[PDB]
Design an enzyme around this catalytic site. Structure first.
Site, PDB file in Angstrom:
ATOM      1  N   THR A 185       0.826  -1.194   0.000  1.00  0.00           N
ATOM      2  CA  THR A 185       0.000   0.000   0.000  1.00  0.00           C
ATOM      3  C   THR A 185       0.869   1.257   0.000  1.00  0.00           C
ATOM      4  OG1 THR A 185      -1.953   0.986   1.029  1.00  0.00           O
ATOM      5  CG2 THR A 185      -0.158   0.288   2.492  1.00  0.00           C
ATOM      6  N   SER A 186       0.291   2.358  -0.496  1.00  0.00           N
ATOM      7  CA  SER A 186       0.995   3.633  -0.468  1.00  0.00           C
ATOM      8  C   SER A 186       1.144   4.124   0.969  1.00  0.00           C
ATOM      9  CB  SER A 186       0.259   4.671  -1.307  1.00  0.00           C
ATOM     10  OG  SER A 186       0.522   4.444  -2.682  1.00  0.00           O
ATOM     11  N   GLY A 196       8.379  -2.781   5.816  1.00  0.00           N
ATOM     12  CA  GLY A 196       9.453  -3.677   6.194  1.00  0.00           C
ATOM     13  C   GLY A 196       8.934  -4.830   7.014  1.00  0.00           C
TER      14      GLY A 196
END
Lengths: 239, 4, 239, 4
Positions: A34-35, A94
């Site tokens: 996702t952004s 991450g």
């Protein structure tokens, strides 16, 4: 001359050093990532904050995993002889030990290995600071109430505890970067860096709590994680 | 608030 | 009343707190783990060092994985209301995230979870210090030249970097514990704890190098790893 | 010198 002490890194080289900011906001559709709304706020806050610490700031946006490795390789091959320190800020998705390029992951270890004491000789003995705003897992905190080691002189300022999500607000930026910049702005001319990062820990731990329509993600807390292999005290100012 |  | 700051943990409770030392030297034959010669030197050094800091020290030798869990559970169920802090020292074999009882492994996270802000309420808000002399892998360093998070207020003082062996001398004790005790002895009435642990980092990094008849293990270095989730500065003295 |  008189008695000498060497408990603090030498920070009066001609240059403070580089501050590389990797700001990954938009990911390739095929990744399904996702952004990262609000990360531009973090990137701009960090640029201004480290500008006032006299770092040479380089902002990089939406880098693939190949571009991240090549950038870090290239930067590690520069001559840092006249530079006091090195700072890298990674803003991305991450997991534990991993940060994401726009098209796939990069081992944190592959990035930092370029700067090892034996592989970047103009940074041997100098502080190498990695500031990492990225998830380290999917746990949520519910809250309550002759030689030197090649791994020496690194500091990993993690946004969150091992195994945990890290929280980002889409209009204010991430909790950790918000707090880090505020504490650098207020205390960089006053406190040793570990003590600054301890104020960051307290600010994140006390002032932030998530609000979500989804009960699973609501009312959660966060604690950052200072991981220091430094061998001296670090003050951003000098005499 | 979103997670990373 | 004059203006007040709360940048430091309150360390003037009636008691400093417990210091639990788990000293695993001899392991069950079936595990195939070697005896940890020199660890008794570490345990005696730690006992004396934390005695002079006014901790209630309890030394435990050669505990199984079941005994370790039961000890930690029992200790976390004590009333710590009159205690400033909690310290646990683990001396054993290990791997990343794992410490070995005499008969098999224990996840570090299972041990520390007993003391979480929500599960040991008489230690909520108080520093919980885990000091870990154990391997975190098999890498060798070749050298060169609600209101608060439940994970807040923990400090993990690791003897070695993630993924690396940790070194122990059969006569003098482990590099890390030797240095930790010497630096607490010299600076506990002078420095904040992170600054003490940074001097420990430098001592291990600069003064120790392995000597082995086996070229694979000869001339190796070590850097400890301070992992802080603390929210305040920690001074062992007060007033 | 030994490793742990």
């Amino acid at each position: 001359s008189g008695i000498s002490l060497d408990n603090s890194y030498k920070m009066d080289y001609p240059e403070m050093g580089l501050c590389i900011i990797i700001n990954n906001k938009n990911f390739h559709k095929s990744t399904g990532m996702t952004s990262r709304s609000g990360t531009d706020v973090d990137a701009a806050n960090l640029r201004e904050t480290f500008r006032n610490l006299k770092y040479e700031v380089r902002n990089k946006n939406d880098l693939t995993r190949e571009e991240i490795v090549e950038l870090m390789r290239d930067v590690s091959k520069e001559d840092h002889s006249k530079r006091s320190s090195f700072v890298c800020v990674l803003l991305s998705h991450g997991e534990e030990g991993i940060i994401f390029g726009t098209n796939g992951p990069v081992d944190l270890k592959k990035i930092t290995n370029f700067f090892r004491g034996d592989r970047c000789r103009s940074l041997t003995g100098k502080p190498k600071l990695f500031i990492i705003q990225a998830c380290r897992g999917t746990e949520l905190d519910c809250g309550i109430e002759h030689k030197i080691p090649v791994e020496a002189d690194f500091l990993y300022a993690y946004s969150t505890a091992p195994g945990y999500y890290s929280w980002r607000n889409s209009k204010d930026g991430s909790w950790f970067i918000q707090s880090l910049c505020a504490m650098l702005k207020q205390y960089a001319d006053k406190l040793e860096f570990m003590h600054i990062l301890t104020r960051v820990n307290r600010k994140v731990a006390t002032e932030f709590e998530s609000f979500s329509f989804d009960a699973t993600f609501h009312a959660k807390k966060q604690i950052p994680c200072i991981c220091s292999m430094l061998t001296k005290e670090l003050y951003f100012y000098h005499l | 608030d979103e997670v990373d």
